[PDB]
Design an enzyme around this catalytic site. Structure first.
Site, mmCIF file in Angstrom:
data_model
loop_
_atom_site.group_PDB
_atom_site.id
_atom_site.type_symbol
_atom_site.label_atom_id
_atom_site.label_comp_id
_atom_site.label_asym_id
_atom_site.label_seq_id
_atom_site.Cartn_x
_atom_site.Cartn_y
_atom_site.Cartn_z
ATOM 1 N N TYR A 99 -3.990 17.457 22.036
ATOM 2 C CA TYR A 99 -3.609 18.867 21.966
ATOM 3 C C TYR A 99 -3.216 19.446 23.318
ATOM 4 C CZ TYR A 99 -5.174 19.457 17.085
ATOM 5 O OH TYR A 99 -5.312 19.384 15.715
ATOM 6 N N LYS A 143 -10.577 6.562 15.947
ATOM 7 C CA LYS A 143 -9.695 5.587 15.290
ATOM 8 C C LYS A 143 -9.564 4.379 16.231
ATOM 9 C CE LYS A 143 -7.106 3.973 11.890
ATOM 10 N NZ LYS A 143 -7.386 3.828 10.433
ATOM 11 N N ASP A 186 -10.361 8.075 8.947
ATOM 12 C CA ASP A 186 -9.915 8.114 7.548
ATOM 13 C C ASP A 186 -11.105 7.996 6.595
ATOM 14 O OD1 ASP A 186 -10.235 5.441 8.407
ATOM 15 O OD2 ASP A 186 -8.615 4.698 7.158
ATOM 16 N N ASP A 199 -10.667 19.100 14.529
ATOM 17 C CA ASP A 199 -9.917 20.202 13.933
ATOM 18 C C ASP A 199 -9.738 19.923 12.433
ATOM 19 O OD1 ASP A 199 -8.392 22.566 13.838
ATOM 20 O OD2 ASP A 199 -6.609 21.548 14.639
ATOM 21 N N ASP A 202 -11.998 21.701 9.362
ATOM 22 C CA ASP A 202 -11.338 22.512 8.355
ATOM 23 C C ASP A 202 -11.595 21.942 6.954
ATOM 24 O OD1 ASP A 202 -10.491 24.286 10.208
ATOM 25 O OD2 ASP A 202 -8.344 23.822 10.076
HETATM 26 N N1 LIG Z 1 -5.232 -2.244 5.823
HETATM 27 C C1 LIG Z 1 -6.480 -2.791 6.132
HETATM 28 O O1 LIG Z 1 -6.684 -3.989 6.041
HETATM 29 C C2 LIG Z 1 -7.589 -1.856 6.565
HETATM 30 C C3 LIG Z 1 -7.631 -0.507 6.262
HETATM 31 C C4 LIG Z 1 -8.697 0.251 6.706
HETATM 32 C C5 LIG Z 1 -9.755 -0.348 7.410
HETATM 33 N N2 LIG Z 1 -9.664 -1.688 7.681
HETATM 34 C C6 LIG Z 1 -10.747 -2.396 8.411
HETATM 35 O O2 LIG Z 1 -11.760 -2.447 7.352
HETATM 36 C C7 LIG Z 1 -13.076 -2.469 7.991
HETATM 37 C C8 LIG Z 1 -13.983 -1.373 7.360
HETATM 38 O O3 LIG Z 1 -13.513 -0.150 7.785
HETATM 39 P P1 LIG Z 1 -14.177 1.136 6.926
HETATM 40 O O4 LIG Z 1 -15.627 0.808 6.668
HETATM 41 O O5 LIG Z 1 -13.752 2.282 7.778
HETATM 42 O O6 LIG Z 1 -13.196 1.359 5.660
HETATM 43 P P2 LIG Z 1 -13.295 0.581 4.228
HETATM 44 O O7 LIG Z 1 -12.200 1.246 3.464
HETATM 45 O O8 LIG Z 1 -13.458 -0.914 4.290
HETATM 46 O O9 LIG Z 1 -14.716 1.069 3.476
HETATM 47 C C9 LIG Z 1 -14.885 2.461 3.421
HETATM 48 C C10 LIG Z 1 -15.986 2.725 2.348
HETATM 49 O O10 LIG Z 1 -15.442 2.499 1.033
HETATM 50 C C11 LIG Z 1 -16.157 1.384 0.413
HETATM 51 N N3 LIG Z 1 -15.113 0.563 -0.224
HETATM 52 C C12 LIG Z 1 -13.841 0.166 0.275
HETATM 53 N N4 LIG Z 1 -13.164 -0.572 -0.582
HETATM 54 C C13 LIG Z 1 -13.997 -0.667 -1.713
HETATM 55 C C14 LIG Z 1 -13.842 -1.322 -2.954
HETATM 56 N N5 LIG Z 1 -12.689 -2.029 -3.250
HETATM 57 N N6 LIG Z 1 -14.855 -1.255 -3.874
HETATM 58 C C15 LIG Z 1 -15.936 -0.535 -3.520
HETATM 59 N N7 LIG Z 1 -16.227 0.116 -2.384
HETATM 60 C C16 LIG Z 1 -15.214 0.034 -1.500
HETATM 61 C C17 LIG Z 1 -16.823 0.576 1.559
HETATM 62 O O11 LIG Z 1 -17.960 -0.081 1.090
HETATM 63 C C18 LIG Z 1 -17.157 1.714 2.566
HETATM 64 O O12 LIG Z 1 -18.315 2.420 2.173
HETATM 65 C C19 LIG Z 1 -12.838 -2.181 9.494
HETATM 66 O O13 LIG Z 1 -12.833 -3.449 10.142
HETATM 67 C C20 LIG Z 1 -11.413 -1.535 9.512
HETATM 68 O O14 LIG Z 1 -10.687 -1.766 10.708
HETATM 69 C C21 LIG Z 1 -8.614 -2.432 7.271
#
Ligand SMILES: NC(=O)c1ccc[n+]([C@@H]2O[C@H](COP(=O)([O-])OP(=O)(O)OC[C@H]3O[C@@H](n4cnc5c(N)ncnc54)[C@H](O)[C@@H]3O)[C@@H](O)[C@H]2O)c1
Lengths: 355, 356
Positions: free
Chosen positions: B136, B191, B223, B247, B251
Site C-alpha cells: 500500500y 502468502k 486464501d 484490510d 473487512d
Molecule cells: N494448486 C496447488 O497445488 C495448491 C493450492 C493451494 C495450496 N497448495 C499447497 O497445499 C498445502 C496446504 O496448504 P493449505 O493448508 O493452505 O490449503 P489446502 O487447500 O490444502 O487445505 C485447506 C483446508 O481445506 C481442507 N481440504 C483441502 N482440500 C480438501 C479435500 N479435497 N477434502 C477435504 N478437506 C480438504 C484441508 O484439510 C485444510 O483444512 C501447502 O503446501 C500449499 O502450498 C497447493
C-alpha cells in the site's frame, strides 16, 4: 488423446486416483501417463518440476493435476519448493486463464456455512489471470532496503506488475464467458490504492467498449470479500488478477459447501488445459483416505469438455456426481444430517457406479 | 498518570464520544480527560484538520479517544484541509503502525450475520493489521513502459510490496502481547508459498515467537484464512497479518459479524499507546440527530483501558455492561430488532452506565 497425470503431494494421489478411476470407467480410450511433480519431483530427481515432467505436460493434450506442497519441503531454497511446480507449469505452458465454477448443488446447501437462502441455486464463474501479477513479477527476494526510513535493514520484497496485453487477453476471455451466461461481468481490483489495479481497471474498461451486450461493473477486493459472504448471488462472472483470484476463490469455495467441491481449468489461447481441484495438498488429512475427491473428479469433467472435445462424457460425469449426492453420499467435509458418510475411495466407487 | 486526549470530531463524533466519556466518568477511576478539536472542527478553530495544539496534546497523552471526522459541509475544502486528513496525520506523526480490528458478534444481533448463527453468535476474535507499510505504500510504483520480461516495452502498472525487519518485528511484538492479554493463540497469515515478502514476514514472526513461548503461534496462507473465517471464525483468537491482507480479512470478518456499526477499532504504537475509535467513521445523514449508535465508541473506550492504561478489569466491566444492555432489549435505530426498546444515543449511553 493423451492426458498427463500429475498427482503430486499430500491428498493429491488419493484424489487423482478417483478421477482416473472415473475416466477409466468411460467407454472412451485415453492414453494416461503419470509423472512426478512437487515434493514427489524433489524425491525423484531433486526438482519440483523435472524436465521430463514438463516435457510430458507439453506433449499431452491435457493435464490432470492433483496438488503440490508438504511442510517438510518448505525450508528448501525457493526454486526447489513444491509450489514452484504448479507456478512453473502455468507459466511455461502459458496457461493464462483460470476458470473456477462455483456451483452449489441442492444437497450441499446445508453444508455451506452461509444461511441456505444465500447459496441455493448459486452459480458463479470466477475467471482468474494466471501468468502475471505479483506472483511472477520481478524484482523479488530479500535485500538491504535501498531507501526509506528503514534503509539498510534486511527487507523482503516482490513487484506487482501487469502489462497491457496481459490484462487484455484475460479481459477478452471473461467478457466472452459473460456473453454466454448472464451478460454481466464484475471486475475486482484494488484500484483506490494500487497503481497496478488502476491500470487493470483502465484496460478492462477499454476492452468493455467491444462488448456492448455485457454490463461491466467494478468492485474493490476488500468489498468483494464482504459481498461473497453477504450476497454472492449478485455475481455471475467475476474477473480478477492472479493474487486476488487466489484469495477470493478459497472463500468462494465455501459457497459450494466445501473447498473439496470446487474444480478448476487453466487454459492457454488454444484451450489446451491443466485441470486441478482449486484446493491444495491438505497435509493434515493426507493418506487418511477421507479427502473429498469430487473437486478433482469435476476437474476431469472440465478436462473432457474444454480440451478433449468430449462434452457428452463431461455431462455423464457431472450427472454421476449429482446422482451420488442425491443418493446421500458425502465425504466428511460435506457431511449433512442422515447422510452416508464415506471415504475417498468409496466416494469414487459411488461416482463410477452412477455413470 | 492516565491522561486521555479526547478528539470528538464532527457530526456524530461528538454525540458518540460524549457517551464514551459518560461511561469513563462513571468508573471509579481518576482520568485526566482533555478535549481538542479535530477534523472539520479543527478547520473551524484554526484552519487545519489536525491543528498543531491538537497533535501536541495527542503526543503528550497516554491514549487518544477519537470519534469520527467528516461531513458534507467540509467536502468542498481543498484536499489537504479535508477532515479525513486528520486520521492519516495522527497515524503518521504518532507512529501508529498496529491496527486492532475486533470481530465481535452479539447473540442478540446474530440474525444480521450471513452465517448460520451457531458459527458466529458470541464471536470475539481480534485481527491485528500492520498499518504503516506493505504494498500500500511501497516504492517504486506507477505506470511505465515495461522495463524487461515477456512484455518489455508495453504499458504496465506496477507496485512494490516490501517489509523490512524492524517493520515485521514491531507488529509481531504488538500482536504477541495482545495474545497474552487474551487466549494465548496467535495466527500469522501470509502468502509465503509464493511471495518473498511473505516468507520474510514468516521468518521474522518465528524469530519473535521465541520470546513468547507462552503463546501458541500458527501460520496460515491468506486464501485458506479467508475460507476459514467463513467456515469457522470461532477457531481463532488473535490473527496478525500485513496491511493488504489485513484490510481484506478484516473487512470480510466485519461483514461476517453482521453489524459493522457495533465494531470498535484502535491504532497502536510500539508502547501500546493507542488511538481508539469506532470503525465506522462519519454518518452525515444522521449527524446531530441524537440517534447514532454509541456502542462502538464505548467499546473503543474499553479497548483503551485494556491496552493502553493497564485497566483490564474496567475494560471487562464496560464490555459486560454492553452485553447487558443488549440482553435488556436496548437498541439504537441501526440495530433495532422486533420488540426492542429503541433509544437514541444519550439514552443508550445511560443504559450502559446503569449496567456498570
Ligand atoms: N494448486 C496447488 O497445488 C495448491 C493450492 C493451494 C495450496 N497448495 C499447497 O497445499 C498445502 C496446504 O496448504 P493449505 O493448508 O493452505 O490449503 P489446502 O487447500 O490444502 O487445505 C485447506 C483446508 O481445506 C481442507 N481440504 C483441502 N482440500 C480438501 C479435500 N479435497 N477434502 C477435504 N478437506 C480438504 C484441508 O484439510 C485444510 O483444512 C501447502 O503446501 C500449499 O502450498 C497447493
Amino acid at each position: 488423446m493423451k492426458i498427463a497425470v500429475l498427482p503430486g503431494d499430500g491428498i493429491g494421489p488419493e484424489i487423482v486416483n478417483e478421477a482416473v478411476k472415473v475416466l477409466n470407467a468411460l467407454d472412451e480410450k485415453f492414453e494416461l501417463e503419470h509423472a512426478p511433480v512437487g515434493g514427489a519431483g524433489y524425491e525423484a530427481s531433486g526438482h519440483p518440476l523435472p524436465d521430463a515432467t514438463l516435457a510430458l505436460a507439453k506433449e499431452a493434450d491435457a493435464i490432470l493435476f492433483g496438488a503440490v506442497g508438504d511442510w517438510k519441503y518448505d525450508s528448501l531454497e525457493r526454486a526447489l519448493r513444491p509450489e514452484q511446480a504448479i507456478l512453473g507449469l502455468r507459466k511455461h505452458l502459458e496457461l493464462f486463464a483460470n476458470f473456477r465454477p462455483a456451483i452449489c448443488y441442492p444437497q450441499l446447501v446445508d453444508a455451506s456455512p452461509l444461511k441456505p437462502e444465500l447459496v441455493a441455486g448459486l452459480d458463479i464463474l470466477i475467471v482468474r489471470e494466471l501468468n502475471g501479477d505479483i506472483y511472477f513479477g520481478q524484482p523479488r527476494g530479500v535485500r538491504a532496503a535501498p531507501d526509506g526510513p528503514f534503509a539498510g535493514e534486511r527487507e523482503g520484497f516482490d513487484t506487482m506488475r501487469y502489462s497491457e496485453p496481459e490484462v487484455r487477453r484475460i479481459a477478452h476471455v471473461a467478457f466472452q464467458a459473460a456473453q454466454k451466461r448472464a451478460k454481466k461481468l464484475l471486475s475486482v481490483d484494488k484500484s483506490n490504492v494500487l497503481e497496478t489495479s488502476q491500470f487493470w481497471r483502465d484496460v478492462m474498461i477499454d476492452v468493455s467498449k467491444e462488448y456492448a451486450d455485457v454490463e461491466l461493473s467494478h468492485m474493490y477486493v476488500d468489498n468483494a470479500a464482504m459481498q461473497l459472504a453477504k450476497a454472492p448471488k449478485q455475481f455471475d462472472v467475476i474477473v480478477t488478477g492472479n493474487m486476488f483470484g487466489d484469495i477470493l476463490s478459497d472463500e468462494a469455495s465455501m459457497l459450494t459447501g466445501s473447498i473439496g467441491m470446487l474444480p478448476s481449468a487453466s487454459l492457454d489461447k488454444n484451450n489446451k488445459g491443466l485441470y486441478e481441484p482449486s484446493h491444495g495438498s491438505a497435509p493434515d488429512i493426507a493418506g487418511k483416505g477421507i479427502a473429498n475427491p469430487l473437486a478433482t473428479i469435476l476437474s476431469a469433467a472440465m478436462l473432457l469438455r474444454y480440451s478433449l472435445n468430449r462434452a457428452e462424457q463431461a455431462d455423464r460425469i457431472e450427472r454421476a456426481v449429482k446422482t451420488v449426492l442425491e443418493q446421500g453420499y458425502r465425504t466428511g467435509d460435506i457431511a449433512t444430517p442422515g447422510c452416508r458418510q464415506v471415504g475417498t475411495a468409496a466416494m469414487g466407487d459411488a461416482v463410477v457406479a452412477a455413470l
